[PDB]
Design a binder for these strands. Structure first.
Ligand SMILES: C[C@@H]1CCO[C@H]2Cn3cc(C(=O)NCc4ccc(F)cc4F)c(=O)c(O)c3C(=O)N12
Ligand SMILES: C[C@@H]1CCO[C@H]2Cn3cc(C(=O)NCc4ccc(F)cc4F)c(=O)c(O)c3C(=O)N12
Ligand SMILES: [Mg+2]
Ligand SMILES: [Mg+2]
Ligand SMILES: [Mg+2]
Ligand SMILES: [Mg+2]
Ligand SMILES: [Zn+2]
Ligand SMILES: [Zn+2]
Lengths: 47, 259, 64, 242, 258, 47, 242, 64
DNA sequence: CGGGAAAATCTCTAGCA
DNA sequence: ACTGCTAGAGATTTTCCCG
DNA sequence: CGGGAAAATCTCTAGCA
DNA sequence: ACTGCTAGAGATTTTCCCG
């Protein structure tokens, strides 16, 4: 798996860790506490 | 050895891998391994920019607000051709009407808009459904997904300031600005104005579609590479393009037999 | 038959981009248009570009 | 090059237009254009017609592109000069309108519409209109039950007519026809621009006096001299401004 | 011929030179000349970024606001070393006190701040005057002039978020953040932390000044190139010459020393 | 001389023309209506 | 390289420290350091002392850098643990404090100051101090006329003392001395870090058993082998991790 | 006399920039420090940098 | 002389009121 | 007459350690 | 084959709620 | 499962027109 730390929207503080459900070009679909979110890769770090 | 001391140092100070390595003589790999285990140290994301869709059928819509008046704008991403209009109240009905006017004049196959309330209104959903348009929504509070249209807003607004003294109504000035942008500003990929560019884009789409249809109808070849009967698409100049299991692959003439 | 149709399909300029490069590249000559993938030749480099990253035009300024 | 004599032969035997000769014979467009112009014997897209059709006491201003039947209809609250001027402004902005044909109504002659045409660079003037309008009315009646207003039904009918009604020589809807026509107009305009920018140059070959210059290529130059088209190497050709 | 038509077109549409030239077959020079004559067509300035001063003795000051509390911050431009402190009220007296504390601990020669009210207060002016500091102000509402300190206002703030759970008060968190930034984050030009970098900058300044003074005291040469000028350095066939506040690099040819 | 068209501060609409008293690197000192102003070169165009 | 035997002879005759030998003999610092360490016969900057001086019924916490006389004084309202802890935190943040000397006051022993020292990584332990403090008091008395309050006078006195009172061997004010001392400490720390990084390597020269590798250059490698410092070409030396 | 002092003054690293380039360049060896102009040598390139655009250090990670 | 993996460098972006 | 910059995240390129 | 000046290309930045 | 971009301003480099 992967660990993804993200900033969702207009929310300066970062969140995570979350599971990486899907990775694309320019955006990534993650699962934070069973909540599926979509975040641009400018607002995510994957480890 | 120094890993435990550096771990305590980080737990207290949240040092970057560079400081940990230079202080406790750690290897950079271990320093970054430690720094990557601190949830409070992941305060940055990948430095890059995505790429919005540029298909011929993609239109990007957005509301802008000028002089206390709502201007609904749509842009052809593939060409930069814009259609803008002043609407009294930013509501679902007016947005659906504008979108339906747009669809009936140009071949709109998809609308990529922000998550505004009006663009999400069920009336707009029904209007898209009837006209066979596919709605797309950017990530919430991610204006970059709509960059093109957003850019146009500024551009559009700029032009208005130039011509707002030649008209009394704001709708008039908006139409003047749309006209100037579409048929009096030249640049872009083809040295065209936006209207000429969209005309060229759509005409080229239709032409290429029909040519490809005719060639496929007349031309048919089965190709073996290295292993199945792939469908030929292009051949010559040392390379051959073959479709096999929804895979467009280019392989040299060698190890590529046609029958 | 196929000769003129191929010749005039390969007369369409194509502008493309890659996943990380944000600048549209020069007019690669078109070679084939697909549903979502277009095959092009940018100075004898035969590439496959996703349709969403491709602008196919018939540059009339250049054509004349 | 080398097909100019074939171009002349085919043109004289068949009297074809420069487009066809250039496409078939691979000639540059400019040389074909000057060939066709030379033949004295061998010797419009941007015009729309407006009409206000009344339904349910509501004015529907319909503009028709004669060359293709492309329809653009808008419900206007009242037959005032302001609304017609705004409609014309929208039309000019969206499409390259050069001339408009009207019925010389009270509103169409208003000073407001006059100024709108003047600024937008359109000139006013006073068989397809009737057929297209009747088709639009039929479609409106067909799809009037799906809309709770009249402007929505008008837009639905316009969409159906422009993009779902396929007809003509190639079974092409109105949208395809209009886009093709405007593309052809653009090609013509670019050709004329190149001709205008090149006609001011003179060429000395072999030295022989000035001759009309048609095209400059990579190693050859095509020129016109006394109705005779000659391809000359660049080395023995000198280009002069005046 | 087409110039009049192009002028009448631009007076209404404000077309760019490209469209004018393409439509009316004008030379690009003439199209740009026409477009440059329209006052309403000048809506963009040259795309570039200046360079802030990075002298050793320059400090950039700015107020940031965190959790409703004013944090006054100063940064050593040449090294990134930062001092910070929570002040109860964004007033002139507290800013002057902070600046006087800073001056007495580090060799501050000039301060470059925004045009805030507190930084313009006459108390701060007097404090700068007494401590022999030179006050510099960026162009109003041009935060890029303070791009260094502003940058720290982010970086410092970021650190404050990591260590705000280790302190009850915001002043303690601010001081912890300053400490971490100065002596626990490494990078920059020299791979140093900010504190090490400032120490190196100041020590190098003093050392270079003193060595240069001694060399000038002992070494002295008069040079004629191509009048009697001073010599500063010679090597690898090149010579550095000082002449009327002009530093020039000239080869040995047309360069003679007496 | 020169013609300088500038945006002064937090003022989206541009102004000018004004005389160019002095030009530097990253900023320019201009005289608009006899008022001497300093403008970053990012907020000025000189012709 | 080169002047290594000369370095040994000079060290034996004069017992100089590695800094002087390396600077004079152009040797890398590491080899000079290993040379000086070899001689048994030939065999502090980040320590401050705090004292609370009461003036006008107001506490002034003065921290003195013993190695240079650098003074950092702050007026504090009350002799509480919180104020001293905050002062120590500011001092540690601004300067590299490793050990603090205190008079074992009640405040200095408070759990708050204990935690502040623990977090900032400082160690508490309980002739220059008196002279420095009395000099500060003299300057405060001198400059009090120019200050509206006492904190302003304290800061003016600190500035005058640190950057306007020039004295010592080289006539350097306290600021110059402290920057020099901290720079020297940084140089020492870098040398020690480099030594630790390199000490874990073995070298086989000419084959001869493992030897202590000291310096690696462009084409020469300086190693230690049984109190013998030898320069070997890069080839004849094989380096290993052990 | 002058030899060792010159060597020491030339042992200092300098980082500089040009009027348009926004990124600091490599550590050019110092050659001379003036009031407002410092003369440096970046790989045998003798240049004059304004003092405000110059960071002069004595990098110890490299000195050691 | 040829590679491998880590180190050094390079490019790019958020955000500072 | 003054002036965007800093630190981190992936990519990419050298380059020292193994043949 | 060598230059000159204009043309073409490149780099960079404001602003879009 | 989605995604920054557009147009203008100087700077710099080709490149056609003159030898
Ligand atoms: C309530 C709707 C739905 C939810 O989102 C909000 C907020 N929003 C914000 C911007 C905005 O921030 N534009 C500036 C900008 C910044 C960066 C960039 F790359 C591009 C840019 F345009 C808009 O333009 C915009 O239209 C909206 C909007 O409509 N909404
Ligand atoms: C009332 C004082 C005096 C007059 O000016 C205002 C407004 N201002 C604005 C920003 C600001 O916009 N920061 C964001 C930002 C944007 C771009 C960039 F390059 C750097 C940046 F920091 C400040 O930080 C700031 O301190 C002030 C301020 O203090 N004042
Ligand atoms: Mg929006
Ligand atoms: Mg928007
Ligand atoms: Mg401020
Ligand atoms: Mg600020
Ligand atoms: Zn951490
Ligand atoms: Zn204009």
């Amino acid at each position: 798996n992967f660990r993804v730390y993200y900033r969702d929207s207009r929310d300066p503080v970062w969140k995570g860790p979350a599971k990486l459900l899907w990775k694309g070009e320019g955006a990534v679909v993650i699962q934070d506490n069973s909540d599926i979110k979509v975040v641009p890769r400018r607002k995510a770090k994957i480890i | 050895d120094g890993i435990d001391k550096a771990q305590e140092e980080h737990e207290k100070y949240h040092s970057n891998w560079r400081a940990m390595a230079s202080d406790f003589n750690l290897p950079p790999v271990v320093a970054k391994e430690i720094v990557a285990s601190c949830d409070k140290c992941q305060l940055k994301g990948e430095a890059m920019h995505g790429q919005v869709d540029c298909s011929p059928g993609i239109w990007q819509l957005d509301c802008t607000h000028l002089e206390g008046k709502v201007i609904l704008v749509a842009v052809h991403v593939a060409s930069g051709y814009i259609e803008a209009e002043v609407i009294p109240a930013e509501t679902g009905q007016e947005t659906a009407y504008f979108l339906l006017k747009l669809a009936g004049r140009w071949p709109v196959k998809t609308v990529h808009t922000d998550n505004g309330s009006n663009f999400t209104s069920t009336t707009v959903k029904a209007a898209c459904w009837w006209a066979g348009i596919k709605q797309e929504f950017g990530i919430p509070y991610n204006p970059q997904s709509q960059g093109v249209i957003e850019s146009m807003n500024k551009e559009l607004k700029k032009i208005i300031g130039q011509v707002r003294d030649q008209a009394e109504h704001l709708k008039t000035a908006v139409q003047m600005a749309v006209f100037i942008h579409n048929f009096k500003r030249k640049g872009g990929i083809g040295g065209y104005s936006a209207g000429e560019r969209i005309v060229d884009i759509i005409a080229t789409d239709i032409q290429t579609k029909e040519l490809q249809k005719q060639i496929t109808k007349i031309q048919n070849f089965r190709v073996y590479y290295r292993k199945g009967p792939a469908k030929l698409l292009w051949k010559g100049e040392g390379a051959v393009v073959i479709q096999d299991n929804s895979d467009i692959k280019v392989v040299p003439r060698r190890k590529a037999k046609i029958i | 038959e196929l000769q003129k149709q191929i010749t005039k399909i390969q007369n369409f300029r194509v502008y493309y981009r890659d996943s990380r490069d944000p600048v549209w590249k020069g007019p690669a000559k078109l070679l084939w248009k697909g549903e979502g993938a277009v095959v092009i030749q940018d100075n004898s480099d035969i590439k496959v570009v996703p349709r969403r990253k491709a602008k196919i035009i018939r540059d009339y300024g250049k054509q004349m």
